[PDB]
Amino acid sequence: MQAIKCVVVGDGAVAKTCLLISYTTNAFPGEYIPTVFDNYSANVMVDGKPVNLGLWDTAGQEDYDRLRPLSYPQTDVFLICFSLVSPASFENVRAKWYPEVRHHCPNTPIILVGTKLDLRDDKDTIEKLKEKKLTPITYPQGLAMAKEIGAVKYLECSALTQRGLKTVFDEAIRAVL
Amino acid sequence: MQAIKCVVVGDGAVAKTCLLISYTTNAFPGEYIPTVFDNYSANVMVDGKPVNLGLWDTAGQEDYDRLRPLSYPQTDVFLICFSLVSPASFENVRAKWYPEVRHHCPNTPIILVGTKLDLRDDKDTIEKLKEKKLTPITYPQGLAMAKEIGAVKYLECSALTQRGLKTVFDEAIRAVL
Amino acid sequence: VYTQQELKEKLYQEIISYFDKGKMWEKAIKLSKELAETYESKVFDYEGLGNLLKKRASFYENIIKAMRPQPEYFAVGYYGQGFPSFLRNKIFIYRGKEYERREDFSLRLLTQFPNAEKMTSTTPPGEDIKSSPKQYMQCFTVKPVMSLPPSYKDKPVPEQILNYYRANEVQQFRYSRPFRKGEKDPDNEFATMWIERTTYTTAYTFPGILKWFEVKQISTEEISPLENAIETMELTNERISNCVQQHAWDRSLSVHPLSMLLSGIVDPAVMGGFSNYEKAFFTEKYLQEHPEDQEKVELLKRLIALQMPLLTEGIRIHGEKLTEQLKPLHERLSSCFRELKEKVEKHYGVITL
Amino acid sequence: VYTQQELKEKLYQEIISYFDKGKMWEKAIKLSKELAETYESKVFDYEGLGNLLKKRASFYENIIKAMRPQPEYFAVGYYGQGFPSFLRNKIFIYRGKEYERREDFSLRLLTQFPNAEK
């Protein structure tokens, strides 16, 4: 049997936790059960043969930087994660989450995800962000960071409607494949 | 599996019938059961491996000469039989039973048996034969006929005490062997 | 001609062949027994017994040796009225395929009909659609109720037997409904959990004549957050036991699954369930929220306590697989494990064997 | 140590082996059934069921396929009093051997004692 190793890192104001806890539980949109323990792995394949897969759930807290670096060694792919409708998330991406993680492992295929893809076109949240001088980073800027990092595919998924979430993990698995 | 074919021919005043019906029934001396049907075959070996054996019970009647000659063809050994304490038996042996049967099949190993071996030394039967000008043919005359016919062994058995009966059929079976 | 005997003989030979190539060996055995019995007690075709018992030996060897996937079970509500007389307003709990993805299955069931839309309120039906045209659909994956097989509750059966029963000879079904009931306090997401589970009975035993099968009886359930903690701990302990033994019965096995589970246990880094159960229950404020409903907590305590030595055995197998690569992982694992041993003993006030 | 289970397991394996090589297959089957039953209902050693059912198939095939001789049965009367306390005046119906000849058997039982008469 063969396994898959991959990482999810980001802030705490975007809640990728819900995204992965609802991709693993197989659950319907809007009816996710939060669970106590982290490290959401799963036994699901998409292409070719069954394999073993995990999802390292990495904290957004700053103090936990001491414990994190040792997971990255001896991995297969990495899922660097950001949000499109959160500017503070983009700031943290350009400051910490893209540079340092890419710094520890500059040698591995990489994939990028775009969170809250339904509030990228929602007028009310966009309005409240404009009033807060906050910008929904559109697709071309994602492409810019993509060709800056050279990911095998810049993807954009969601959790209110699960649009392309399975597509995201499909591409992530087929990165080595 | 392999079989054995062999013949017993002689007069009717000596009763080789009892001899063979008591060798096949496995029975104790003096307690033989006569049976209706002739052709006493048996499933017994002595040496090497089990085999199939029969005993053609041949009539002493003269009329049945028409039916007899066809058994001899395609056989393995023959048991030409006579009696030591019957002179009429010896006369028939020198007239019919040695010459003609040896004539039909001059090409096969042959064995000779000596019947009533306990009346060859019984004084009362010998007396009654002397009074009837009848002779118990002793062993040297048997040897004479033996080296005249060239049998693989001239044997002498009995039925009141079964002396060497099993020896006789042992030699007869080991004739080809 | 075919008198009845040789007919069933041909029938059972073919049925065995089908079950054989179809990866359902429990039944293939169950029938090869009937064959052999009738052979050797009625017709004495001992060549038949020969090759038959040969085949049954192969059956048992396959059941233990290899391992086979678990089908995923969905539950399709063909809602509306624009549907035929036989699909109209009742749920077809489709057996699925080895690793089917709810998107793939709802896709095929889009292909199965015009009007490829989806519903949203997955728990209750839709009243406006309870007689409307423009055919409606809803697709969701559920969990198979474990059969409670006879003659297996007391022996320590190997895993293979149980995992193979884990999806077949199944008749009851269940799904998860997260209901929000409690204060939306800042960090504590677990203070509002309530589950009203879905009770589904399909009166035909999968697998059968058809993959799909309509539900027969549907019932509602209810789960309080204490009882939710109950099932969460039961499932956690069982997962740990299963991984422990399934690695105790193999050697060419990745160290990854146990690193996975033990890491999950040790560092609820994003969200911490231990202290959050604590904030919900262990305080006196919850005894003001529950004066007379208490012993659920003793269940939780003894279950985490029994998790502790099973966690210890997981650490033992971890050390059996520990290396310079696992050196820092087991370093932190031993650290927080000792801390948690002393925490449960002195800090908690709980008792364990 | 040997708790009872693995002891009878060794015992029945040996008993089956003896009946096997000894050309009495009806009993060897009759016991391989008890083995397999206890395996698959108590310990689940399905490798055991595998090789066990294999062996039982061989058993049934042998019962029909080949053919084996019939022992000859004698009946010995150890008559008299100069005999021990356990052989004195009662008949020992010896099972024999595949094609034993009453002369051969009474010969061996001559060898078994002094005073070889009949």
From Swiss-Prot, chains A, B:
Effect listed in the UniProt record for changing P73L? In MRD48; decreased substrate adhesion-dependent cell spreading; weak dominant-negative effect
- Tissue spec: Isoform B is predominantly identified in skin and epithelial tissues from the intestinal tract. Its expression is elevated in colorectal tumors at various stages of neoplastic progression, as compared to their respective adjacent tissues.
A Gene Ontology BP annotation from the UniProt entry: actin filament organization
Its EC number is 3.6.5.2
* Domain of life of the native organism: Eukaryota
**Disease note:** Intellectual developmental disorder, autosomal dominant 48: A disorder characterized by significantly below average general intellectual functioning associated with impairments in adaptive behavior and manifested during the developmental period. MRD48 patients manifest global developmental delay and moderate to severe intellectual disability.
* Name of the protein this chain belongs to: Ras-related C3 botulinum toxin substrate 1
Swiss-Prot record, chain C:
Q: Where in the cell is it found?
A: Cytoplasm; Cell membrane; Cell projection, Podosome
Domain named DOCKER is located at 1-353
* UniProt remark on domains: The DOCKER domain may mediate some GEF activity.
**Hey, which family's this protein in?**
Belongs to the DOCK family.
- Main role? Guanine nucleotide exchange factor (GEF) for Rho and Rac. GEF proteins activate small GTPases by exchanging bound GDP for free GTP. Along with DOCK1, mediates CRK/CRKL regulation of epithelial and endothelial cell spreading and migration on type IV collagen.
Give the multimer and partner information. Answer: Interacts with CRK and CRKL. Interacts (via N-terminus) with tensin TNS3 (via N-terminus); the interaction increases DOCK5 guanine nucleotide exchange activity towards Rac. Interacts with ELMO1.
What is the protein's given name? Dedicator of cytokinesis protein 5
- Its source organism is Homo sapiens
Q: Which gene encodes it?
A: DOCK5
Which part of the full protein does this chain span, and how long is the full protein? 1290 to 1642 of 1870
